[PDB]
């Protein structure tokens, strides 16, 4: 995937996820960033972690080089919160992450890959259409119809478990990046 694109990664870092499975999420994300043409004139990346609260791990407003982003990702620490506040994470995207004042490019399309394994704890409001969300629902505890509503027009990418995530998901994520649509 090589294009002008503001990409967000949103990883659930709750206790229900656990440190092992969160690290699998991190490793999935690293592999995606490695495959993406991340650079000042191409793909830009923001990274969020959420559970009880939402942490901006890397804003668009910081250096948009693959090396700088990947190293910050390695430094991300599992929070292990007691909630899955997916609604709050989505509000961050619309009201903070994708603002020009926060480093987003006005003429770049917006794409979000959100990794979650549990039902939302909180109220979820539908995002403005200009923020495209591709939900990645991992494991048996994902609330699928909830993800379908968050994702529209994007079908959720359903992954059997966090072990499979870093192996299977990157290909699908990059296909969606380049074409602008999910498969079949
Ligand atoms: Na943008």
Swiss-Prot record:
What range(s) does the VWFA domain occupy? 6-173
* Portion of the parent chain present: 1493 to 1674 of 2813
Q: Which residues are glycosylated?
A: 23, 82
The protein here is known as von Willebrand factor
Provenance organism:
Homo sapiens (Human)
Which cysteine pairs are joined by S-S bonds? 177-178
The protein's superkingdom reads Eukaryota
């Amino acid at each position: 995937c090589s294009m002008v694109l503001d990409v967000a990664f949103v990883l659930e870092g709750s206790d229900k996820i656990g440190e092992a499975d969160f690290n699998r999420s991190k490793e999935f994300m690293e592999e995606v960033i490695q495959r993406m043409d991340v650079g000042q004139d191409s793909i830009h990346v923001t990274v969020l972690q959420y559970s009880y609260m939402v942490t901006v791990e890397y804003p668009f407003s910081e250096a948009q080089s693959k090396g700088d982003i990947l190293q910050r990702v390695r430094e991300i620490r599992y929070q292990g919160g007691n909630r899955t506040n997916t609604g709050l994470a989505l509000r961050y995207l619309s009201d903070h992450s994708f603002l020009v004042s926060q480093g987003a490019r006005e003429q770049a399309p917006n794409l979000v890959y959100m990794v979650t394994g549990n039902p939302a704890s909180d109220e979820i409001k539908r995002l403005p259409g200009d923020i495209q969300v591709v939900p990645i629902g991992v494991g048996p505890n994902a609330n699928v119809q909830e993800l379908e509503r968050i994702g529209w027009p994007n079908a959720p990418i359903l992954i059997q478990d966090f072990e499979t995530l870093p192996r299977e998901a990157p290909d699908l994520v990059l296909q969606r990046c380049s074409s602008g649509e999910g498969l079949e």
